[PDB]
Amino acid sequence: PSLWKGLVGIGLFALAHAAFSAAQHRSYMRLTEKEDESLPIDIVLQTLLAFAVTCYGIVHIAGEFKDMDATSELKNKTFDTLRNHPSFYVFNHRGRVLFRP
Amino acid sequence: SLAEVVCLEMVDLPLTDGLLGMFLKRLSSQLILLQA
């Protein structure tokens, strides 16, 4: 469904928020200068979840696969269509006379 | 008096368990920064 598309947006949005958090946490270090060198578990969990869901949405978004056998789409092609030859059309048929000229 | 200085130093200026709580405070900080 189309809702899949909407999902991927929010995933990025989620990721975007994570970025902000990370930046802030980096500022934290850049204002704490302690031997932490570790991101908060909440923010990393949020980032991982955003990655997972966004990838999952993408999986739907990629589309649908197509079968390799060339005789797939031609099965329903009746002979009444392939014979038309649009370039070689002729207008000397009963359609013009029968219908309004 | 500052003609004869003995020692000087440079001092830096002054600065200008559950995941649900962490998210709550983080989102609160986000709203605070947005308001600022």
UniProtKB/Swiss-Prot annotation, chain A:
Keyword Iron appears in the UniProt entry: no
Recall the GO molecular function terms of this protein's record.
Answer: cobalt ion transmembrane transporter activity; ferrous iron transmembrane transporter activity; inorganic cation transmembrane transporter activity; magnesium ion transmembrane transporter activity
Write out the GO biological process terms: copper ion transport; magnesium ion transport; protein insertion into ER membrane by stop-transfer membrane-anchor sequence; tail-anchored membrane protein insertion into ER membrane
Task: Please give the residue ranges for the topological domain Lumenal.
Answer: 21-41
Q: Which residues cross the membrane?
A: 2-20, 42-61
Primary location: endoplasmic reticulum
Could you tell me where this protein is found in the cell?
Endoplasmic reticulum membrane; Golgi apparatus membrane; Early endosome membrane
Give any Gene Ontology cellular component: EMC complex
Assigned keywords, A-Z: Endoplasmic reticulum, Endosome, Golgi apparatus, Magnesium, Membrane, Phosphoprotein, Transmembrane, Transmembrane helix, Transport
Coiled-coil ranges per UniProt:
none
Record's keyword annotation contains Membrane? yes
Topologically, how does it sit relative to the membrane?
Multi-pass membrane protein
Its family remark reads: Belongs to the membrane magnesium transporter (TC 1.A.67) family.
Protein role: Part of the endoplasmic reticulum membrane protein complex (EMC) that enables the energy-independent insertion into endoplasmic reticulum membranes of newly synthesized membrane proteins. Preferentially accommodates proteins with transmembrane domains that are weakly hydrophobic or contain destabilizing features such as charged and aromatic residues. Involved in the cotranslational insertion of multi-pass membrane proteins in which stop-transfer membrane-anchor sequences become ER membrane spanning helices.
Give the record's subunit note.
Answer: Component of the ER membrane protein complex (EMC).
Q: What is this protein called?
A: ER membrane protein complex subunit 5
Q: What is the organism field in this record?
A: Homo sapiens (Human)
Gene that encodes it: MMGT1
Please tell me where this chain falls within the complete protein, as first and last residue plus total length: 3 to 103 of 131
Swiss-Prot record, chain B:
Briefly state the protein's biological role: Part of the endoplasmic reticulum membrane protein complex (EMC) that enables the energy-independent insertion into endoplasmic reticulum membranes of newly synthesized membrane proteins. Preferentially accommodates proteins with transmembrane domains that are weakly hydrophobic or contain destabilizing features such as charged and aromatic residues. Involved in the cotranslational insertion of multi-pass membrane proteins in which stop-transfer membrane-anchor sequences become ER membrane spanning helices.
- State the gene name recorded for this protein: EMC1
Official protein name in the record: ER membrane protein complex subunit 1
The illness linked here is: Cerebellar atrophy, visual impairment, and psychomotor retardation: An autosomal recessive, neurodegenerative disorder characterized by developmental delay, intellectual disability, hypotonia, scoliosis, cerebellar atrophy, and variable dysmorphic features.
Please specify the portion of the entire protein covered by the chain, as first and last position out of its full length: 448 to 497 of 993
Q: Which organism is it from?
A: Homo sapiens (Human)
Q: Where in the cell is it found?
A: Endoplasmic reticulum membrane
Q: How does it assemble?
A: Component of the ER membrane protein complex (EMC).
Hey, which family's this protein in? Belongs to the EMC1 family.
